[PDB]
Amino acid sequence: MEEYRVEMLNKAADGRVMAFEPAVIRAQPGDTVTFVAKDKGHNSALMKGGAPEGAETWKGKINEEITVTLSKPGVYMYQCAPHVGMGMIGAIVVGEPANLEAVKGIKYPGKSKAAAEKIFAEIESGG
Ligand SMILES: [Cu+2]
Numbered sequence: 001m002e003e004y005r006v007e008m009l010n011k012a013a014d015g016r017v018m019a020f021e022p023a024v025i026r027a028q029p030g031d032t033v034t035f036v037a038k039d040k041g042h043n044s045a046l047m048k049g050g051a052p053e054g055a056e057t058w059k060g061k062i063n064e065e066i067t068v069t070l071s072k073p074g075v076y077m078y079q080c081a082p083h084v085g086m087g088m089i090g091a092i093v094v095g096e097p098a099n100l101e102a103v104k105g106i107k108y109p110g111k112s113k114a115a116a117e118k119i120f121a122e123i124e125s126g127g
Pocket of ligand 1: 018019041042043080081082083084088
């Protein structure tokens with residue numbers, strides 16, 4: 001088991017405002033990801049229909065440094081509720097992205113649509 005960290009930040013290294021860093025975690029089945037409240041006012045919650053079938057969901061409170069389990073392989077699309085409209089979403093890819101087509105079709109409100117397009121390009125082609 002590997003244990004990864006995703007920081008919830010107001011300002012990222014690459015200039016993003018309201019951002020999870022890294023935006024895309026590449027994990028294996030059984031690994032964990034812990035969210036870090038480096039800046040306050042953020043949360044982490046799984047987006048509706050943004051996980052592979054039968055996967056455990058999560059809905060972290062504001063400033064809650066929640067650790068999520070990643071048993072089933074696939075792409076997990078999650079968001080910050082306060083800043084999702086500003087584009088604050090992230091991805092956790094577990095094993096092979098089998099449900100990549102399905103997660104492309106979910107609801108991405110506001111600037112998270114452009115953020116999702118950047119995330120999907122990063123997973124598929126690297127950049
Ligand atoms: Cu936020």
